[PDB]
Structure formats: C-alpha cells, structure tokens
Amino acid sequence: IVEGSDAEIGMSPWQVMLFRKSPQELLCGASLISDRWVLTAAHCLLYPPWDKNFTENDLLVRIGKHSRTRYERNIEKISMLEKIYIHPRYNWRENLDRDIALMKLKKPVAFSDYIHPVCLPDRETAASLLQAGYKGRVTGWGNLKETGQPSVLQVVNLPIVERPVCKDSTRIRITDNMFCAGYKPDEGKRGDACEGDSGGPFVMKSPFNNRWYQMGIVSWGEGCDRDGKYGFYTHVFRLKKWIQKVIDQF
Amino acid sequence: ADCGLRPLFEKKSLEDKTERELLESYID
Amino acid sequence: FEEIP
C-alpha cells in the first residue's frame, strides 16, 4: 500500500495473507468470507504470461495477522487449502475481466478478536454504496512504493471514480465487472494498492446497518500511485452469482 | 450472521481512526 | 519471514 498508514489491531480481521511455501514469501492478499472460504484475485493463482499457476499444496493462508514477517504466535492461524476455484471466464489473456477466485480451507478456522469474516454485498448494497466519490478501504502488506516493505498491515481509504474517468485513464478495455478508485491529480490526497496487495479486499462500511462489505478485490493497475492512474478492482457483487454457485456446490 | 462486525470495533461500539472519513463520503 | 511451526 503506497501512501497509507499502519492498521490498528483488529481493524481488518477478515484480512488474509496468501503465503508461498517455498520460497517463503508474500504472494497476495485475500479475505475471509466464512469459516471455510477465502476470496482472492484469480491472477494471484493463475497468470500464464508470467508462468504463474499455483496448486493447492504450494501456498498457505495466514489469518489474523498484523505484522508482515513475524510468526504471530497465539494470534494468527495458518490454514491449508483443500481446493482452489478460479472463475471459468477469467480473462487472463486480455484485461483480467472476472479476476476472482475462491479457496476452500481444509478445516474451518476459529473466529477470534483478530479473525472474523467480512460481508458480501447484495444488489441493494451495491446500488447504495458503489457511487462515484464514495470511499472504500484497501489493506495489505504489499510494497510501500512502486520502486520498501511494511512492518505491519497498511490501510488507505480511496474514493470510487466515475467510469468515464477510469476509462479515459488507460488503454486497457474496462468492463462492467471492474471499477476504479483513487484520487485525481487535482485532489491533493494520494494512495494506492501495490505489489503484494493484490487479491486483497476493498471494503465499505454500510451507513444503514454498520457492517463492513467487500465491494472489490484489488485486481490491477499500471504502476502504483501514479498521477492520473487509478487502481482497478473486481466488482464483487457482479460476480456473486458465481460465488454462490461455487459455495452451494462445494 | 455476524459478518462484517469487528470484535474490537463494532461489537464493542468503538470506532477506528479513519472510518469517519468513509461515512462523510456517503453523501447521497 | 520468521519460520512457521
């Protein structure tokens, strides 16, 4: 996270670290959506142009963390993967359309002060909250700059951007399954996700019921925190029918 | 049932340091 | 990263 701040303890208890087994390293962010299911970006798991194709046995999920590098004894929980499910129409060839994946954990994780699932939006949630200028929150242990690494989880709040502005910022084809967020050059505030943060959650606190909802997944960008560029996020509600289908089936 | 309600915040009626920024942006 | 048990 570039131009963010340290998270408070228990601020993002749904935050998940995807951790490569060998070499030991941060792969991506993710989120906890139930005792048994974690949500992330498909590109965290499958991106053939860079020869990325993880199997279940290649990574671990670390839940309840604050420190990036420490083993947070008696606090974090380490979980193994039972199965990975990538959206079947994820478009890794072109523009990362439908950049979403689910992971089922081998065993259910116990909730605690530090570990608690985020809500997924329904249609009404999305309509109310996905509006230009409304701010959401992005968290992660990724790089602090485009070109180092944080001691603890970072957070930044960022406004949703008007679709034409998003479309005009990039040569990449934007779809309805994406939204963008970030400050404009003229706004004076800064902030973005970066390498290490992808797959993590973009969340909003509903002012109607005071619950946190995962509205996006950190999907892609061009550089990090560049003027006139915006981060792109997978639109979770637009893909909820697929999420439900997977959870219902498996 | 309790999704999205943080044990160290909403469950105990404490607010984090920047959630008010989010609220203030929810203007419609 | 610190080693994990």
Ligand SMILES: NC(N)c1ccc([C@H]2[C@H]3C(=O)N(Cc4ccc(F)cc4)[C@H](C(F)F)[C@H]3[C@@H]3CCCN32)cc1
């Ligand atoms: N908000 C940002 N500034 C930002 C968000 C996410 C990323 C992601 C993805 C990202 O942007 N990728 C490059 C890419 C962008 C657009 C495309 F159409 C195709 C490919 C990678 C591809 F695998 F998806 C991903 C890698 C993995 C580590 C960081 N980075 C970079 C920057």
Ligand SMILES: [Ca+2]
């Ligand atoms: Ca364009």
Ligand code: NA
């Ligand atoms: Na920018």
